[PDB]
Amino acid sequence: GQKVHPNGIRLGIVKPWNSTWFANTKEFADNLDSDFKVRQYLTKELAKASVSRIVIERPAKSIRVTIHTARPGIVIGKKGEDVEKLRKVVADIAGVPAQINIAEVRKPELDAKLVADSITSQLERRVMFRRAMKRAVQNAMRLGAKGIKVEVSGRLGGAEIARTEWYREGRVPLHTLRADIDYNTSEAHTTYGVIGVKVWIFKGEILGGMAA
């Protein structure tokens, strides 16, 4: 409750948005709800495949959903028809004609969500929490990142007291307005309660801002 949310301050410098179509004060509540529904359905449909980001667009009364994942095999399916099969249901949800795109990420351990994922899975399957934390740190460090701050709140390792713990390797700035700060948060459900996982990742210095 002290630090500012970094995405909301990095929106207008380097970090791209997740919804930037054109509405006029009438249908964006509806567009926002449709985006939320399609994202929450995509999460439940691809809870196994590691999925990090979902972006939306609305060119000329048509919805385009772009998914950035690391296991496109499950979503594509055999003979490349499951993607169209689920495009049918997302088009039914969105009403307007729909199309979907896949932006499979090579070496995606630098993605905030996919680096905060599978550690929730290890905690759920009762793997040691300290082992999971150190594995996540080493995996996020070995790919060339310059710093990952992940915050874990609530019953560390299925404990009985909601405590606060956080590791930090490298350097993770939060006040610099040029540093690419990929931020996300996830939750783990266990037999003893719920745990929160917040992740900041410092990609490095990026000058020139947008337009590559």
Instruction: Yes or no: say if 119 and 92 are a contact pair by the CB < 8 Å rule.
Output: no
Classify the C-alpha dihedral 79-88-96-113 as positive or negative.
negative
Q: Is position 157 an interface residue for RNA (rule: CB under 7 A)?
A: no
Q: Name residues contacting Mg ion, limited to 152-211 (CB under 5 A).
A: 193
Is residue 108 within the footprint of RNA (CB under 7 A)? yes
Q: Does 103 bind another protein (CB under 8 A)?
A: no
Rounded least distance, CB 157 to Mg ion, Å: 13
Considering the complex, what minimum distance in angstroms separates the CB of residue 15 from another protein? Answer: 7
Rounded distance, CA 97 to CA 34, Å?
A: 13
Q: Which of another protein, Mg ion, RNA, none has residue 174 at its interface (CB below 5 to 8 Å by kind)?
A: RNA
Residue-wise DSSP of 110-166: GSHHHHHTTHHHHHHTT--HHHHHHHHHHHHHHTT-SEEEEEEESSTTS-SS--EEE
In total, the chain counts a number of residues equal to: 212
| CB distance 100 to 66 below 8 Å | yes
Exactly one of 18, 99, 156, 178 binds RNA (CB under 7 A); that residue is 178
Q: Which is nearer to RNA, 65 or 179 (CB)?
A: 179
Choose among another protein, Mg ion, RNA, none what residue 177 binds, the Cβ cut-off being 5 to 8 Å by kind. RNA
Using CA atoms, how far apart are residues 188 and 81, in angstroms rounded to an integer?
32
Q: Are 202 and 179 in contact (CB under 8 A)?
A: yes
Among 2, 3, 14, 18, the residue binding another protein under the rule CB under 8 A is: 18
Q: Is 172 helix (H, G, I), strand (E, B) or coil?
A: coil
**Closest CB to another protein among residues 29, 143:** 29
- Rounded least distance, CB 210 to RNA, Å: 9
C-alpha–C-alpha distance, residues 146 and 176, integer Å: 14
Q: Taking CB under 8 A as the rule, which mask of x and - marks residues 127-166 in contact with another protein?
A: ----------------------------------------
The one-letter amino acid code at 11 reads L
88 is a site residue for RNA (CB under 7 A): no
| Inter-residue long-range contacts of 122-126, CB under 8 Å, 24+ positions, other chains counted | 123/157, 123/158, 123/188, 123/190, 123/195, 124/188, 124/189, 124/190, 126/158
Binding segment for RNA (CB under 7 A), chosen from 39-47, 52-60, 87-95, 139-147, is 139-147
28 forms part of the interface with another protein (CB under 8 A): yes
The span of 29-37, 55-63, 93-101, 121-129 binding RNA (CB under 7 A) equals 121-129
- Chain residues in the site for Mg ion (CB under 5 A): 193
